[PDB]
DNA sequence: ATGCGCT
């Protein structure tokens, strides 16, 4: 009979479809489907599972998936064999086991294929060698889901009592508005320092300008820190004689970024085009639904062979030799870039603007990234004035290399060592060192993503919940931690500080691992985490006296 | 009268 195939993105299956032809029904699974809605009933009635009761859960179709789930009912009525063809990591693992238990059937009518990419290499050998579904692998993701269940339904109300209504605390969510409330903190302490900088006007014996900075006296760091300390120095540096000490001419290079992932897509959109989050998703989506990129929610830099191979023979035909290396470029889903570099931005026509412009974006990020470094001939000028010493750096452009993909929007005249310097003016500038930059939509996202926070699919998510709950404003596009936050952030550290570190999820993500790997059990591990949970939350249903949450 | 994180 006719096979049937199941994955997640709609988009995909349309495309598998395709490098499958009929004989096979593929669809998608649009998501997730199904999920969650001493011990109290109301509770656990409300949580959808049971800390009390071996952790039985109570799962049910998503409001707006009755449909998708309807439809895909039937259709496995004239199928044979259902080939479940999710992601391999423990969230798609669980979408396939979701699906399992939603149509029904006998165990084994139903396989476990992954689909390597799109080319022909690889949906066929999807069907070659495959499996079963992971039942460790489905209940790591159960395990992580529920412990993030108990934690925001049950220290959420401990919030309401103890300091508002209609307040939230969540793994995530909570260290989030820390990283806000600690840059706050930082800020309004700063304290700016004043210090001075000199710098000097000289013509060379052939008559040529040079500007040079003061770097140092007496062998010292030259940083006058007041006018007054700036002046003693100025004085001296107007009467001394300048020398020429040494001059070093070296070879520089200036190397490509990675390809794109969500992060940095984001902070990219953000500092060249003033895309905020969301928006960037928004049409990141629009160009992957027409088949311009690939899936726009994702953490790896990763490139294909064929995706190498594609874009070296681009940058071979359309820039040269001195453009290609001599092997592709190494560096430590996919990557975000675009489905065929034959593509440019202007033929889409049927694009908004700023899809465009994203999509630019990530073409010339991704070739620009396999093209050869740029090069500089750099110079640095040492001299010499009585005790001080200044230097003067320049720079020449021998070879763009990627910049020619990737533009980013210098010359020392000739000097010997030994040579006499004529002193034509000195410039004094006083200055105030700075206070940390605020967070940005991207910059917050950032921060996340290098402590391994959240998930690509969630973190502009995450930047809207802690507004909407009113822990942080967004304001010049910039963020402000709002007295709320706080609030929050002081009571949750002070009751569930484990909870509150920002290392929780990665302590979490190892003994998660440790259930997909056999090396542990998932309901003793569950077991482990609420018993310690429940210790904190009882500790703070007491009076502040008894060590318990300060009411506001 | 009510809250999480992820696809
Ligand atoms: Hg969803
Ligand atoms: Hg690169
Ligand atoms: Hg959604």
């Given at each position: 009979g006719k096979a049937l195939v199941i994955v997640e993105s709609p988009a995909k299956a349309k495309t598998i479809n395709k490098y499958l032809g009929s004989d096979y029904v593929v669809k998608s699974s649009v998501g997730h489907i199904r999920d969650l809605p001493d011990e109290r009933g109301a509770l656990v009635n409300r949580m959808g599972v049971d800390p009390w009761h071996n952790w039985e859960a109570h799962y049910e179709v998503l409001p707006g998936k009755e449909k998708v789930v309807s439809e895909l009912k039937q259709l496995?009525?004239?199928?044979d064999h259902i080939y479940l063809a999710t992601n391999l990591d423990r969230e798609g693992e669980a979408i396939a086991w979701h699906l399992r238990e939603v149509i029904?059937?006998?165990?084994?009518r139903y396989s476990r294929v992954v689909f390597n990419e799109i080319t022909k290499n690889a949906i066929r050998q999807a069907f070659n060698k495959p499996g079963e579904l992971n039942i460790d692998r489905v209940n790591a993701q159960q395990a992580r889901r529920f412990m993030d269940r108990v934690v925001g339904y049950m220290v959420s109300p401990l919030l309401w009592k103890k300091i508002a209504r209609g307040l939230s605390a969540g793994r995530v969510q909570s260290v989030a508005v820390r990283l806000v409330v600690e840059r706050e903190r930082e800020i309004k302490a700063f304290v700016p320092e004043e210090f001075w900088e000199v710098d000097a006007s000289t013509t060379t014996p052939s008559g040529e300008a040079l500007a040079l900075q003061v770097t140092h006296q007496n062998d010292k760091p030259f940083r006058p820190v007041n006018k007054e300390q700036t002046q003693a120095a100025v004085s001296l540096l107007e009467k001394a004689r300048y020398s020429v000490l040494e001059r070093e001419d070296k070879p520089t290079t200036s190397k490509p970024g990675a390809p794109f992932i969500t992060s940095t897509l984001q902070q990219a959109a953000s500092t060249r085009?003033?895309?905020?989050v969301k928006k960037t998703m928004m049409m990141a989506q629009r160009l992957y639904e027409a088949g311009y990129i690939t899936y726009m929610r994702t953490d790896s830099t990763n490139l294909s062979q064929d995706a190498v191979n594609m874009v070296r023979g681009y940058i071979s035909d359309n820039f040269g030799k001195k453009y290609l290396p001599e092997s592709p470029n190494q560096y430590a889903h996919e990557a975000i870039?675009?489905?065929?570099?034959?593509?440019?931005?202007?033929?889409?026509?049927?694009?908004?603007a700023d899809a465009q412009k994203l999509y630019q974006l990530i073409w010339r990020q991704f070739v620009a990234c396999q093209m050869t470094p740029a090069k500089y001939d750099s110079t640095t000028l040492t001299v010499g004035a009585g005790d001080f010493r200044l230097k003067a750096r320049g720079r020449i452009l021998r070879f763009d290399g990627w910049t020619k993909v990737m533009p980013a929007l210098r010359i020392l005249p000739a000097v010997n060592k030994g040579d006499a310097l004529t002193l034509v003016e000195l410039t004094p500038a006083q200055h105030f060192t700075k206070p940390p930059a605020r967070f940005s939509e991207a910059s917050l996202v950032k921060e996340l993503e290098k402590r391994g926070i959240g998930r690509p699919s969630t973190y502009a998510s995450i930047i809207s919940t802690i507004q909407d709950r009113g822990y942080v404003r967004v304001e010049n596009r910039r963020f402000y931690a709002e007295k709320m936050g706080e609030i929050v952030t002081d009571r949750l550290e002070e009751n569930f500080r484990e909870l509150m570190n920002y290392d929780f999820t990665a302590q979490m993500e190892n003994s998660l691992d440790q259930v997909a790997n056999h090396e542990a059990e998932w309901k003793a591990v569950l077991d482990h985490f609420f018993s310690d949970f429940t210790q904190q939350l009882d500790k703070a249903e007491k009076d502040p006296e008894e060590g318990g949450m300060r009411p506001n």
């Open positions: 496995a009525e004239k199928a029904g059937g006998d165990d084994a085009l003033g895309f905020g870039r675009p489905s065929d570099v034959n593509v440019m931005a202007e033929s889409l026509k049927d694009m908004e």
